[PDB]
Write a protein that binds this ligand. Structure first.
Ligand SMILES: N[C@@H](CC(=O)O)C(=O)O
Ligand SMILES: N[C@@H](CC(=O)O)C(=O)O
Ligand SMILES: N[C@@H](CC(=O)O)C(=O)O
Ligand SMILES: N[C@@H](CC(=O)O)C(=O)O
Lengths: 315, 315, 315, 315
């Protein structure tokens, strides 16, 4: 049987009222792979931070570099799973499958979703076709690419969706089928690597907008020495006149400003705002939290606005 | 023919490269109603603020109180339309139809959506069945209730959706059908009224959350004398341990804290956070920007957490 | 505790590799209601037929008429659940809650969905607010009205959706909230009643359409003495020229022809076809299988096309 | 400028109350391509048939083989556009872009969608990145692959969706971005070619199922010398016991039986039906009308059930 490393971080999948505990609860896993489990952390994903991301990434890369390891499965809380998944997609250098999985119902709930989710996740990680597709997220019988996947609902077991594109494949009781290949750069084609990164990453805040908005929190972010700011703008990345004036002054001072959107789907374009006039960056179709991940990494490399915009076009 | 008042505020529906200009561009409107048009403002809805909301609401109420006016149509930019619509739903006291409408493509675009949107909006406002349903939003052949409607995409003409419930009716080239009646309190059943409200409304900020979150912007909001704060939490209104400690201290000091979600749909429940232990409010299934509207209004009446939670259950 | 009758018919909820078996498997049910269980049938819902519908409806009505019964829960396979639910919505005369529930994963599956589905279903049936809302379907933490609900996916646990409107409420671990009230006639306001109905119901076939369509199967339906035919037309109920000519001749001969759509959502309108010229009926926004249910019932009352079209506008 | 051939077939895009008429109505097209227009037919797509498909395919292939032609755009009614698109995806042998486009509102409607749809379609056809992606469908600012795209609503301008996967790219006022590459075989990798095909194609009927189903129409299809039958089954391709017995006898007699689903999305699996025991084929995640297209083509090559099932796994 193929050897799979299972890296546990915590989350509702391990919620109750770590490894293993899991594996012990699903003996059928032993028919499809040899599992090498370890505990990376034991937290709710609401407490996920850079220190854990780096520990997780370093350990994953070490295992991926081992010729005896065929793939890696990571159990993770669902709340920030989309952020961890995108971070790993950009920093891991391997063609072997890396699969994140969680659960929306705690392990002792009636009709808990975790057991079958974990069973498919392992099935996807051992499949030959899962290679070279970047970091994957397997939830609710569906296979998503890391760039595209978002948590869309507070409580539904089907909360994960790819709002701009769609799922790249399906998995039903272990049977895996792919229909689509992601085109944006990932993993081995990424210019980012762990050996070139150090904690802390550059500070990047996210500012929310609404009717009657004022730039006071935006100014507070600048005062706190933010190196970049992602704006969750209204509609197509829009902001009030007063907000725009503050953004212009910030960008002139060398703070990198990214226009994203609070709406949840679709690309941000120039149009009502002339981004080239002020040196702003548009966040493609990434939501604010994924735009922050890419911007934090970009800022370790460069402050050049043209180069950063190119990264948003490629990743 | 029935008399309809048309109140124009600006937006992409009146975008190019006010009244009327519109009406002049759609002569077929004269077959279905007598239109009394006026300009309330001429702004992008990204610049919407309390001063305009109050001017708009006062004028709408005056017209609704006139026995010669059968209904009111308001043209508005799409970016903050969901916020204005919910504000009006809570402060207008009439059973007559009030309909908001906008356009996603500017008036001089190929295949501009505004003309047909405005034609249906007027058709809905003159329909007898449109009475007693609260404030309505008509976009892309669909009729939505003000509480439920959200802009979900940056650029699509079908951007408006009701993610938690659904549309209450359809309108196709003026032909109107209703299938559902909203149950949450609105308009005439609302405890809020214009004669009891004054500008400025209590200050309420919205704080976004993400992996590696820190309460620094939250603290800045407190320092700026916010009376309430809406948290756009991860998943089911969740926050990091450090954030929770700051929220606890704030609530003890008398600042009203509402747990909402960044995810975009679903209700926020107690569960991982014991709201009753700390005096926090959960925002039902309202997104952060609509939760802010209700909280601003609540704070003109009371600071009592139990009473505010009841408002989130009723409105 | 309130008394609830549980009527079991079969389905994947009782699938393995009847009552009770269920109840025995979920002891927490005893804390919320006194359950009176009985087996109406034990079949896959793919084998559902009129004989079982009548047995089920008669038994449900008898129980609903009993002052000791507070509500009725019916366990049913998911494949034809939307058809049974709509049939009951039209023939049961009671204001007490009737709730249908099923499961997408068999009872011995990892992460089986049936237990929690049944727990909520019972919770909805005992809730005072569930009265006067017509027949309800509870699946995957969601409450749907019988007219609107459709199975949209072959295998997903979240397969049920209301594509034209939306869910009327939510239920999360027994906690029930309603947001919308259905407006189309149901239950006590229905003109159909069991005491006026006999098996067999009038024969109604459904004909599918596609590119290169020919009316040969349509003709076979006529030859088999169909009293009505529902056409699952392309787009807005459309058919080829040759098909239209056959439909015209059929309608002239007294066969009732209903134009529905294969597409899955939206209302069918006159437009490319002048229904009034030929005496055709349009199926509102009902899909072909629900249009068949209403037409079968209509045909027990009348053959008058104007009266049948009015039924499609009211139910 | 690049030369694009525009092949017009009819449809609502050319509806009123052919070429050009179109082009004449959109002069901005001349800035992006040299257009060579011709009329292939002038029909509603509800009247689409094999004779027109073959004329259209032959003409498209001839143009694609011309070194002076950079791409082909086909205007088509929306009702059967998904069927024509999939047929062309399987029979055209070229890496050059072939793009189908239509309109949901007639050309003289307020806010007609056709002009901007056609402008993007041409923009996609001239883009270098559009090559090698199979046949494309461009509607409502979105780029879909031919295998995946379905019409889901009777009247909405956003009616086209890819329910199992998602859109492969976006186009906004001519600006094109791709995010995904289709993996199933198409165009140059297809084993089907025009030079090996003749009209009429083998007869294949589609049978709809519902509660109280009987195999009478299925038998009528056999009597009409159908070579294959696609069943639009309930849920996961399911049928009544009586229907299954008829299907078994048919398959034993050499008629090829494909289990599809009426539900609209998801793959059909073996499970409740042992397909291998009876020689049935499952239609992957194709809906009944697209399964019919592939089966008609399969039957020109072979009657071998194993080989036909492999085609459903590859195309
Ligand atoms: N708060 C939990 C939610 C979950 O896992 O579903 C976490 O993200 O760890
Ligand atoms: N920014 C514009 C967008 C629109 O109207 O579509 C506004 O909201 O006024
Ligand atoms: N074929 C099964 C499917 C299910 O229940 O999920 C039935 O409808 O009985
Ligand atoms: N019946 C028309 C519908 C459309 O084009 O939108 C056709 O398919 O030709």
């Amino acid at each position: 049987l193929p050897t799979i490393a299972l890296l546990a971080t915590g989350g509702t999948i391990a919620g109750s009222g770590g490894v293993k505990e899991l594996l012990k609860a699903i003996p059928s896993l032993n028919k499809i792979a040899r599992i090498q489990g370890e505990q990376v952390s034991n937290i709710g994903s609401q407490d996920m931070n850079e220190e854990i991301w780096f520990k997780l990434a370093q350990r994953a890369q070490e295992l991926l570099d081992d010729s005896r390891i065929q793939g890696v499965v990571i159990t993770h809380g669902t709340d920030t799973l989309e952020e961890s998944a995108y971070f790993l997609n950009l920093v891991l250098h391997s063609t072997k499958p890396v699969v994140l999985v969680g659960a929306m119902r705690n392990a002792s709930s009636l009709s808990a979703d975790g057991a079958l989710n974990l069973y498919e996740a392992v099935s996807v990680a051992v499949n030959e076709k899962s290679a070279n597709k970047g970091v994957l997220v397997v939830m609710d019988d569906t296979i998503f690419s890391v760039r595209e996947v978002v948590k869309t609902h507070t409580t539904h077991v089907s909360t994960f969706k790819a709002l701009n594109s769609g799922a790249i494949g399906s998995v039903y009781y272990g049977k895996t089928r792919y229909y689509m290949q992601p085109l944006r750069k990932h993993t081995t084609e990424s210019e980012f690597s762990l050996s070139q990164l150090k904690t802390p990453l550059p500070k990047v805040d996210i500012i929310y907008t609404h009717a009657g908005m004022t730039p006071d929190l935006f100014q507070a972010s600048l005062n706190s020495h933010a190196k970049g700011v992602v704006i969750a703008g209204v509609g197509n990345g829009n902001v009030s006149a007063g907000f725009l004036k503050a953004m212009q002054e910030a960008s002139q001072m060398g703070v990198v400003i990214v226009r994203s959107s609070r709406v949840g789907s679709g690309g941000v374009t120039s149009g009502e705002i002339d981004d080239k006039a002020y040196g702003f960056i548009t966040s493609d179709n990434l939501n604010p939290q994924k735009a922050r991940v890419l911007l934090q990494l970009a800022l370790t490399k460069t402050n050049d606005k043209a180069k950063i915009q190119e990264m948003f076009e490629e990743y």
